[PDB]
Amino acid sequence: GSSGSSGIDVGCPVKVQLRSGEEKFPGVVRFRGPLLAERTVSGIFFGVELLEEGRGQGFTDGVYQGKQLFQCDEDCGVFVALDKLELIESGPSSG
C-alpha cells in the first residue's frame, strides 16, 4: 500500500538517513517529538533505534541537550523527521 499517506509512530521499523543520500540505517521508533522552535526548520523529530545493520551511529543516545527523551543502547538512538524515515514492510516472507 503506497498511495501517498504512510505513517510512522513509536514502535515501528524505519530507515534513517544520517548523511545526504549515503545510506539509510533501519531502526525501530522509540520516541517522537519536536526540539527546536523557529530556529532552523519546523519539523517533528522521530526517535529511532539503529538496528544491527546501522548499529553504532547514534548521537543523542536517548538524551538530547540533557533531556532524556528515550532510553537506548550506546550510539543507537537517533532523532529525525518523518521525511527522513523510511517505512518498511513487516512481511519479509510473502507468497
Swiss-Prot record:
Regions crossing the membrane: none
PTMs per UniProt: Ubiquitinated. Polyubiquitinated in hepatocytes treated with palmitic acid. Ubiquitination is mediated by E3 ligase TRIM47 and leads to proteasomal degradation. Phosphorylated on several serine residues by IKKA and/or IKKB in response to immune stimuli. Phosphorylation requires IKBKG. Phosphorylation abolishes TRAF2 deubiquitination, interferes with the activation of Jun kinases, and strongly reduces CD40-dependent gene activation by NF-kappa-B.
Residues in CAP-Gly domain copies: 36-81
Location(s) in or outside the cell: Cytoplasm; Cytoplasm, Perinuclear region; Cytoplasm, Cytoskeleton; Cell membrane
Tissue: Detected in fetal brain, testis, and skeletal muscle, and at a lower level in adult brain, leukocytes, liver, heart, kidney, spleen, ovary and lung. Isoform 2 is found in all tissues except kidney.
Subunit structure: Interacts (via CAP-Gly domain) with IKBKG/NEMO (via proline-rich C-terminal region). Interacts with TRAF2 and TRIP. Interacts with PLK1, DVL1, DVL3, MAVS, TBK1, IKKE and RIGI. Interacts (via CAP-Gly domain) with microtubules. Interacts with HDAC6 and BCL3. Interacts with MAP3K7. Identified in a complex with TRAF6 and SQSTM1. Interacts with OPTN and SQSTM1. Interacts with CEP350. Interacts with RNF31; the interaction is indirect and is mediated via SPATA2.
Disease entry from the Swiss-Prot or TrEMBL record: Cylindromatosis, familial: A disorder characterized by multiple skin tumors that develop from skin appendages, such as hair follicles and sweat glands. Affected individuals typically develop large numbers of tumors called cylindromas that arise predominantly in hairy parts of the body with approximately 90% on the head and neck. In severely affected individuals, cylindromas may combine into a confluent mass which may ulcerate or become infected (turban tumor syndrome). Trichoepithelioma, multiple familial, 1: An autosomal dominant dermatosis characterized by the presence of many skin tumors predominantly on the face. Since histologic examination shows dermal aggregates of basaloid cells with connection to or differentiation toward hair follicles, this disorder has been thought to represent a benign hamartoma of the pilosebaceous apparatus. Trichoepitheliomas can degenerate into basal cell carcinoma.
Task of the protein: Deubiquitinase that specifically cleaves 'Lys-63'- and linear 'Met-1'-linked polyubiquitin chains and is involved in NF-kappa-B activation and TNF-alpha-induced necroptosis. Negatively regulates NF-kappa-B activation by deubiquitinating upstream signaling factors. Contributes to the regulation of cell survival, proliferation and differentiation via its effects on NF-kappa-B activation. Negative regulator of Wnt signaling. Inhibits HDAC6 and thereby promotes acetylation of alpha-tubulin and stabilization of microtubules.
Name of the protein in its database record: Ubiquitin carboxyl-terminal hydrolase CYLD
Species in which this protein is naturally found: Homo sapiens (Human)
